[PDB]
Design a protein around this ligand. Structure first.
Ligand SMILES: O=C1Nc2ccc(Cl)cc2[C@@](C#CC2CC2)(C(F)(F)F)O1
Lengths: 551, 398
């Protein structure tokens, strides 16, 4: 084992971990643990204790996979909740797109590393656990090194690994070593034999510090599988995505499927799940069986064809530009591919329809760009140049007139419809000749009964009763009427700041039926000018509707 | 090798704030930087047994090719014990600001408090574990640094405070504010003089900040629209000035007329307006600053590069209001402008009251968090929350 400075551990302030009793086991298990232990004891791993130790964890004996031989496990479950907190190992994991192309790649599985690292002697006592024996006639142990299943084992090991490599990395800056779990991914632009030889240096170096790793003949060769991809040293491809074809589709099956199809929508173009998803409506159980519809049986089939398509990719070249191009693949739905050389993608992805209270394309596009920008700072530490389906004039008009701080990095217009636009724009001044609707709406704070209507110059008017409504719902209702009972050019004066603001923000999507209807009416008109006036004042027209919507 | 023991507010624990992603460029600069401070004993790499963490990044404050390490101890400060303002600072002709952060490297930090100052240098694509450090000296940006250093600070300052007992020197965090009613040449030279004295160790105008007046539109002819908008703005202002009346104007609107119809003002409405303009020719009486209460800085996007703001503690009782503009080159960056604005208003709030204001920013969280760091240039970071500016609130200060 290793000779590296142990890390100083302590129990969460106050707390202390001595207790949880031994789970008396059969005579076959009690001796199948008496054995395995006698082993470790020798290797220097565990140390038969007892001298002064009140703490204790329960040992179990589980049927070792495929073995008539037994295997042990130790419930530190308790010990851990009483163990100080460590610095997270970092759960942000490397994505293929950020890797740099290499000539050779090797993966060193340090695996059996936890038991290779020295534990904080000072803390060992706290590890104690026991082996039962028929007639409680007397086996007490405690670890001397990182324990399989102990809170700090990973964290402390990873840190030991970082230290042990530090020198080697300074010495060979042309070599890239990537840590992750018990794995070491080493890549380089050296010639095959030169590379193989550095690995041996690395392995022996790791072995000098007690960290055993695999031989060049025990090494595992490319491509390597990484969270869905096949990693080759010059490029990557996507592990085949097999969809099963059954006669029995429980709810579970339908979901997992949708689940895989979703993951696939990032990589593959044209995947659909709308109809597989329709199949979950009103389901009563996971084990429930749902017959796939005709359209369901169909997209699934059209999706299998798509999944056959082989998708390859390229790694990162720091000497080239990062370019991100976006497409509106439906309302609120966007597609993106980031590349450096035309058609040679580093990464692609999809952002699903963010269904909120009220936005529009330009706004939606803006968030998409912010998302891809953060993703990029993460992957490459760089922001791509954008090629967006929008005109500098629209963006120009939108921001120049939007109430919120909004922005978009260096970008370029790309004329690839469907484009992102402003489906309508409110006038900035009243309209001459256009009619003038003075709308209003109200509701009780106890009955939720409301009235919504309007009065206009040209005598036209109309009131209406609502039930189970609110002030804001009635106020919006009022504006809808006006857009209906009006010509192609309208002036509307409301007293609702609520209504005003929602509309001022010129939205093209919402989850409110009403709002959507108004949106429609709005797109239709030739000219609309919306105005606001303070609620209850003797303000001509507004005092009039304030009269009708009050019973 | 002395060290005053510093502790966390009772029952509180160290900060475990996550490090946002950094650009390659900012990472590289930070590795250079930290390696230096490591060699000089300023910091030391830490182990996993330390679970605290604070965000750090890099900036370039006003004309610099070389980067500056910036640490966001906001959370650590909010968790650090408390420790213990010459109104003369605000009432000056000119006030200059100075970065004395360097001074702190000189003082060693209570070793037991070091664990909390832990920070991390990220790696692109997570391909490498981040580089972890913790301070051995007093960190810049920490609320405790200025305090524990006050003692030495004042010392080195007496000479200049005795030589020139007419200037005011107030320190906030890593900054030192010096104000004098001198003329620029002598003023800036007397400053350079102070930086000379400081070196043998290691441009604002206050009489210009006030509560801007609300102005009302005046026109040849008035339409129904014009009058409504007018009455709306007034009706709001009635909230700040109860005297403000709209009876006469509203009458001009009695009836459901076209929005564009031209309405002839009455002698009465004209008096009503005449009278309101006057009520508005000054800030509302009885508005005083309360130190036992938080300062609040609200900002609205006016568009075309303009940003109005109001600093206040209680609603409708503005301690100060203003506008910010231009800043050539930022001609197409709302985030740059906003960040500059927030800084400009913080410094200002510091000068005046010697404390930072809690900001209410008209921007989406994501947008601001992505880029604000790209344009920050102070040594401090105020607090903030994001909002959806009322359609009204804007036309009013507009
Ligand atoms: O930067 C690169 N280039 C690269 C190219 C192809 C392969 Cl298969 C692997 C890599 C590599 C890695 C890694 C683990 C994350 C997966 C390596 F460290 F070099 F091994 O990181």
């Amino acid at each position: 084992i290793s000779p590296i400075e142990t890390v100083p551990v302590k129990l969460k302030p106050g707390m202390d971990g001595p207790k949880v009793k031994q789970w008396p086991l059969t005579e076959e298990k009690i001796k199948a643990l008496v054995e395995i232990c006698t082993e470790m004891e020798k290797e220097g791993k565990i140390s038969k204790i007892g001298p002064e130790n009140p703490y204790n964890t329960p040992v179990f004996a589980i049927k070792k996979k495929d073995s008539t031989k037994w295997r042990k496990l130790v419930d530190f479950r308790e010990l851990n909740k009483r163990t100080q907190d460590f610095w997270e190992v970092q759960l942000g994991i490397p994505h293929p797109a950020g890797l740099k192309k290499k000539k050779s790649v090797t993966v060193l599985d340090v695996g059996d590393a936890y038991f290779s690292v020295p534990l904080d002697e000072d803390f060992r006592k706290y590890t104690a656990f026991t082996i039962p024996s028929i007639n409680n006639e007397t086996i007490r142990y405690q670890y001397n090194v990182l324990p399989q299943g102990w809170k700090g084992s990973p964290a402390i090991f990873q840190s030991s690994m970082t230290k042990i490599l530090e020198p080697f990395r300074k010495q060979n800056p042309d070599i890239v070593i990537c840590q992750y779990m018990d794995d070491l991914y080493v890549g380089s632009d050296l010639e095959i034999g030169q590379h193989r030889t550095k690995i041996e240096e690395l392995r022996q170096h790791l072995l000098r510090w007690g960290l055993t790793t695999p031989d060049k003949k025990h090494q595992k060769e490319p491509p390597f599988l990484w969270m869905g991809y096949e990693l080759h040293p010059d490029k990557w491809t996507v592990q085949p995505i097999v969809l099963p074809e059954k006669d029995s589709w429980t709810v579970n099956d339908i979901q997992k499927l949708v689940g895989k199809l979703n993951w696939a929508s990032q990589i593959y173009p044209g995947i659909k799940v709308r109809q597989l998803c329709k199949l979950l409506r009103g389901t009563k159980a996971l084990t429930e069986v749902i017959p796939l519809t005709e359209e369901a049986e169909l997209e699934l089939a059209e999706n299998r064809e798509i999944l056959k398509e082989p998708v390859h990719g390229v790694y990162y070249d720091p000497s080239k530009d990062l370019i991100a191009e976006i497409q509106k693949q439906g309302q609120g739905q966007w597609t993106y591919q980031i590349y450096q050389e035309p058609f040679k993608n580093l990464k692609t992805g999809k952002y699903a329809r963010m269904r909120g209270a009220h936005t529009n394309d330009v706004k939606q596009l803006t968030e998409a760009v912010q998302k891809i920008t953060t993703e990029s700072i993460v992957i490459w530490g760089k922001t791509p140049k954008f090629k967006l389906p929008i005109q500098k004039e629209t963006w120009e008009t939108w921001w120049t007139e939007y109430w919120q701080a909004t922005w978009i990095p260096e970008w370029e217009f790309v004329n690839t419809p469907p484009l992102v636009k402003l489906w309508y724009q409110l006038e900035k001044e009243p309209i001459v000749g256009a009619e003038t609707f003075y709308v209003d709406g109200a509701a009780n704070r106890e009955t939720k009964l409301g009235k919504a209507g309007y009065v206009t110059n040209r005598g036209r008017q109309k009131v209406v009763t609502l039930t189970d409504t609110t002030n804001q719902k009635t106020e919006l209702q009022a504006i809808y009427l006006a857009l209906q009972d009006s010509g192609l050019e309208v002036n509307i004066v409301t007293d609702s700041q609520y209504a005003l603001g929602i509309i001022q923000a010129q939205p093209d999507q919402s989850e409110s039926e009403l709002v959507n209807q108004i949106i429609e009416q709005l797109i239709k008109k030739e000219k609309v000018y919306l105005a606001w006036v303070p609620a209850h004042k003797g303000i001509g027209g507004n005092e009039q509707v304030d009269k009708l919507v009050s019973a | 090798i002395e060290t005053v023991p510093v502790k966390l507010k009772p029952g509180m624990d160290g900060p475990k704030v996550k490090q946002w992603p950094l650009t390659e460029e900012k990472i590289k600069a930070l590795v250079e930087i930290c390696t230096e401070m490591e060699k000089e004993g300023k910091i030391s790499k830490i182990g996993p047994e330390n679970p605290y963490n604070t965000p750090v990044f890099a900036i370039k404050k006003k004309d610099s090719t070389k980067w500056r390490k910036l640490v966001d101890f906001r959370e650590l400060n909010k968790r650090t014990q408390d420790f213990w303002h010459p109104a003369g600072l605000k009432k000056k002709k000119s006030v200059t600001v100075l970065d004395v952060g360097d001074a702190y490297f000189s003082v060693p930090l209570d070793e037991d408090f070091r664990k909390y100052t832990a920070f991390t240098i990220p790696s692109i694509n997570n391909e490498t574990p981040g580089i972890r450090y913790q301070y051995n000296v007093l960190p810049q940006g920490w609320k405790g640094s200025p305090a524990i250093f006050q003692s030495s600070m004042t010392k080195i300052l007496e000479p200049f405070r005795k030589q020139n007992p007419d200037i005011v020197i107030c320190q906030y965090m890593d900054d030192l504010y010096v104000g004098s009613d001198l003329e620029i040449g002598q003023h800036r030279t007397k400053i350079e003089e102070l930086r000379q004295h400081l070196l043998r160790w290691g441009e604002l105008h206050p009489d210009k900040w006030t509560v801007q007046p609300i102005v009302l539109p005046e026109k040849d002819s008035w339409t129904v629209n014009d009058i409504q908008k007018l009455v709306g703005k007034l009706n709001w202002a009635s909230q700040i000035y109860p005297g403000i009346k709209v009876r006469q104007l509203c009458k001009l609107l009695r009836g459901t007329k076209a929005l564009t119809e031209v309405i002839p003002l009455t002698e009465e409405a004209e008096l009503e307006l005449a009278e309101n303009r006057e009520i508005l020719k000054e800030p509302v009486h009885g508005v005083y600053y309360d130190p036992s209460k938080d300062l609040i800085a609200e900002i609205q996007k006016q568009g075309q590069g303009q940003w109005t703001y109001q600093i206040y503690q209680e609603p409708f009782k503005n301690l100060k209001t203003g506008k910010y503009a231009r800043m050539r080159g930022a001609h197409t960056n709302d985030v740059k402008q906003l960040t500059e604005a927030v800084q400009k208003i913080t410094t200002e709030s510091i000068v005046i009251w010697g404390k930072t204001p809690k900001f209410k920013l008209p921007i989406q969280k994501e947008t601001w968090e992505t880029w604000w760091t790209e344009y920050w240039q102070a040594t401090w970071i105020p607090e903030w929350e994001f909002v959806n500016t009322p359609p009204l609130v804007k036309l009013w200060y507009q």
